[PDB]
Design a protein around this nucleic acid. Structure first.
Lengths: 58, 62
DNA sequence: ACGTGATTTATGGCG
DNA sequence: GTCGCCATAAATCAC
């Protein structure tokens, strides 16, 4: 398992911090970032799931 | 400020037993779950949910 | 070891 | 009604 490309982590962070009042990317905006970042929509889901909870925990 | 801002792990034997069963059938009748439940010291609800998750896990292979 | 991506138990409510 | 799906929350697991 790898730790993501920086550009991919560039994108994910960008998104999350932008829409912070509702950090829940529409089901289609998931393929957008999954395409942008190169990862899977699944990995995007994991990311926001992880980011979201670890975010309140810090 | 934002609103959106604010579990037990099963044993090796329990998982194996659930995996086996799933391997025979993806869906479990209420009687079958009541059985399995007593068989593994888990609830009927826990068995139900374990199978719901296992299906969503298998589906995540499409 | 540890950070971070992934997986496992549980819930709610929608269809 | 009656039942599974499915997006998430949280806790763990594990490269």
């Amino acid at each position: 398992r790898r730790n993501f490309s920086k550009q991919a982590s560039e994108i994910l962070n960008e998104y999350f911090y932008s829409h912070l009042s509702n950090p829940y990317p529409s089901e289609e905006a998931k393929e957008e970032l999954a395409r942008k970042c190169g990862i899977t929509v699944s990995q995007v889901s994991n990311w926001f799931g992880n980011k979201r909870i670890r975010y309140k925990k810090n | 400020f934002y609103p959106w801002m604010a579990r037990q792990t099963y044993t090796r034997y329990q998982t194996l037993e659930l995996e086996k069963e799933f391997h025979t059938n993806h869906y479990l009748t209420r009687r079958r779950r009541i059985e399995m439940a007593h068989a593994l010291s888990l609830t009927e609800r826990q068995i139900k949910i374990w199978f719901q998750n296992r299906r969503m896990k298998l589906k995540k292979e499409i």
